[PDB]
């Protein structure tokens with residue numbers, strides 16, 4: 036099982052300037068619950084977006100995708116292709132825009148947090164992957180984050 040997990044604005048923006056323009060504690064808690072114990076795969080820019088004090092994310096096999104043969108990610112595995120990262124019962128791709136697009140053909144689950152923020156797309160933004168008609172989705176109710184933004188969880192699945 037390969038799953039993708041991300042949070043997006045209604046516009047599809049997931050990232051800007053190498054970081055994320057919101058932070059919902061409830062989304063972070065859901066992310067930790069879904070990924071804990073499993074392999075997490077991320078692009079090198081997403082690894083860079085994590086503060087060194089929080090890396091590697093605990094209780095998970097941290098895998099970083101990079102084309103740089105000598106890139107060092109302390110506490111993580113650095114691989115040159117996505118297929119090297121797929122040797123576990125459960126693998127979660129945790130970002131960013133490039134790696135979501137690369138991993139989508141392998142994926143059968145997407146856990147999506149929709150953030151009710153009006154954030155028009157801009158040049159340079161990272162975007163959520165486009166899900167075609169093979170995906171079926173189950174939506175949750177709109178909820179209030181303590182950060183002030185509404186959010187809801189989508190669970191997409193396909194065979």
Ligand SMILES: NC(=O)C1=CN([C@@H]2O[C@H](COP(=O)(O)OP(=O)(O)OC[C@H]3O[C@@H](n4cnc5c(N)ncnc54)[C@H](OP(=O)(O)O)[C@@H]3O)[C@@H](O)[C@H]2O)C=CC1
Pocket residue numbers: 040041042043048049050051052053054055077078079080081082084100101102103106114115116117129130131132133134135137161
């Ligand atoms: N809202 C959310 O839930 C999340 C948002 N984000 C945001 O996403 C943005 C980053 O996404 P993005 O800029 O798309 O970069 P990524 O995080 O997807 O990393 C891209 C890098 O991954 C490596 N890579 C990409 N494709 C391949 C390949 N086919 N083979 C080998 N290595 C490859 C390269 O590393 P190298 O250059 O070293 O070769 C490339 O520069 C940031 O703003 C981040 O905050 C991230 C996670 C979650």
Ligand SMILES: COc1ccc(Cc2cnc(N)nc2N)cc1OC
Pocket residue numbers: 040041042055062063066085092128129130148
């Ligand atoms: C602030 O530190 C982090 C930034 C991004 C992530 C990855 C992520 C978060 N939420 C959701 N739904 N999906 C994701 N792939 C994690 C982080 O700290 C653990």
Ligand SMILES: [Co+2]
Pocket residue numbers: 068069070071072073
């Ligand atoms: Co689990």
